[PDB]
Amino acid sequence: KYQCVKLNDGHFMPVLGFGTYAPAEVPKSKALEAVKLAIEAGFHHIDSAHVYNNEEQVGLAIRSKIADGSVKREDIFYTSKLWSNSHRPELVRPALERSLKNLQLDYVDLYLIHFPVSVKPGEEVIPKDENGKILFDTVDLCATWEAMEKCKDAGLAKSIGVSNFNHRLLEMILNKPGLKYKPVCNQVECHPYFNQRKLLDFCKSKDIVLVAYSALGSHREEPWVDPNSPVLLEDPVLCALAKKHKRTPALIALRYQLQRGVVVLAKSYNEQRIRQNVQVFEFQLTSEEMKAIDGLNRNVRYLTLDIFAGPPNYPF
Ligand SMILES: NC(=O)c1ccc[n+]([C@@H]2O[C@H](COP(=O)([O-])OP(=O)(O)OC[C@H]3O[C@@H](n4cnc5c(N)ncnc54)[C@H](OP(=O)(O)O)[C@@H]3O)[C@@H](O)[C@H]2O)c1
Numbered sequence: 001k002y003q004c005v006k007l008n009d010g011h012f013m014p015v016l017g018f019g020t021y022a023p024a025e026v027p028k029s030k031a032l033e034a035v036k037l038a039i040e041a042g043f044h045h046i047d048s049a050h051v052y053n054n055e056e057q058v059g060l061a062i063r064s065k066i067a068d069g070s071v072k073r074e075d076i077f078y079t080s081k082l083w084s085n086s087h088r089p090e091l092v093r094p095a096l097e098r099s100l101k102n103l104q105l106d107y108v109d110l111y112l113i114h115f116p117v118s119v120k121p122g123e124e125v126i127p128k129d130e131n132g133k134i135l136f137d138t139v140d141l142c143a144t145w146e147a148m149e150k151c152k153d154a155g156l157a158k159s160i161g162v163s164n165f166n167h168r169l170l171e172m173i174l175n176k177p178g179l180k181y182k183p184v185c186n187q188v189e190c191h192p193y194f195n196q197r198k199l200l201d202f203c204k205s206k207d208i209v210l211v212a213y214s215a216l217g218s219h220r221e222e223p224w225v226d227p228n229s230p231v232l233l234e235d236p237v238l239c240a241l242a243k244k245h246k247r248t249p250a251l252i253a254l255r256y257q258l259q260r261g262v263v264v265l266a267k268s269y270n271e272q273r274i275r276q277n278v279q280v281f282e283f284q285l286t287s288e289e290m291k292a293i294d295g296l297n298r299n300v301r302y303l304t305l306d307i308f309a310g311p312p313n314y315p316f
């Protein structure tokens with residue numbers, strides 16, 4: 001057994017997820033070993049995406065661990081994401097099918113709209129013109145959503161959700177005429193320096209689960225993240241809590257999320273830290289400790305994705 005939350009479509013999501021993105025300088029082979037170790041350590045939720053360029057490796061990890069008898073498919077919750085070159089409704093299913101072919105899996109447990117800004121279709125994930133300008137595309141995301149709903153009725157995605165949506169774009173989906181399925185989740189940046197309380201409360205009021213990425217302060221990959229941004233895990237309050245509980249600042253930051261009702265992702269490709277992160281289930285924070293962590297909030301967003309700023313759907 002393992003800790004899961006009931007989604008608004010009746011499916012269950014493990015509350016601790018394994019993040020799989022690594023910057024491009026890291027070989028892909030590392031994804032294979034890391035996901036196997038994650039499963040060994042007791043992660044039951046694995047977070048990837050087409051744009052991570054690792055689904056062949058992550059899929060092989062999964063398959064290997066099923067095939068050697070370590071785990072059943074039903075006890076892996078696998079998430080992929082629809083990249084913005086495939087927002088057009090007729091391209092949604094083909095993108096999911098392509099992911100599933102790279103994975104050699106029959107379905108994903110969760111498929112998300114990765115980012116609300118659309119780009120031109122084709123193989124290139126960030127298509128640019130000859131002058132380096134991103135080739136943006138105009139797509140009705142409520143039509144993209146209808147295409148997601150059909151993927152769910154086809155059984156290719158057990159649940160569907162979104163990522164990097166703001167209040168306005170969520171309302172846009174939720175208020176859609178003929179809506180069949182609400183998003184189960186909104187996967188967004190969330191940590192003690194950006195605790196998303198307002199958006200969390202909104203999602204709760206709608207029974208949408210907030211899934212926290214960059215919960216340990218992000219991969220800090222340039223130029224996506226500003227190197228002058230504070231280092232979350234160096235925070236003196238988180239470090240003092242860690243010392244008090246004989247844990248680590250990472251574990252404090254992960255436990256914080258669980259207790260506030262957030263499903264939390266954690267990426268590590270280091271054997272020791274993968275095993276450490278599952279220790280989030282071994283301790284609890286008092287109300288006073290949780291308040292101290294609420295106090296660290298500083299409106300620091302690490303991932304702006306501001307190369308996609310300009311179009312109206314840019315969410316930040
Ligand atoms: N939907 C989106 O738009 C979106 C955006 C960003 C992230 N994500 C997802 O969320 C995942 C996690 O976010 P993120 O990758 O930015 O990284 P994150 O989980 O905040 O982690 C940041 C760093 O923490 C280190 N770390 C992990 N465990 C640690 C521990 N116990 N003690 C100290 N350091 C630790 C890792 O280094 P080591 O590997 O060396 O341990 C990693 O580099 C991604 O992999 C991806 O699956 C989604």
Ligand SMILES: C[C@H](C(=O)O)c1ccc(-c2ccccc2)c(F)c1
Nearest residue numbers: 021024049051052114125126303305
């Ligand atoms: C933000 C999102 C994520 O981290 O999930 C993400 C991840 C990776 C990319 C990315 C795409 C092309 C080259 C290098 C990185 C990207 F454009 C968006």
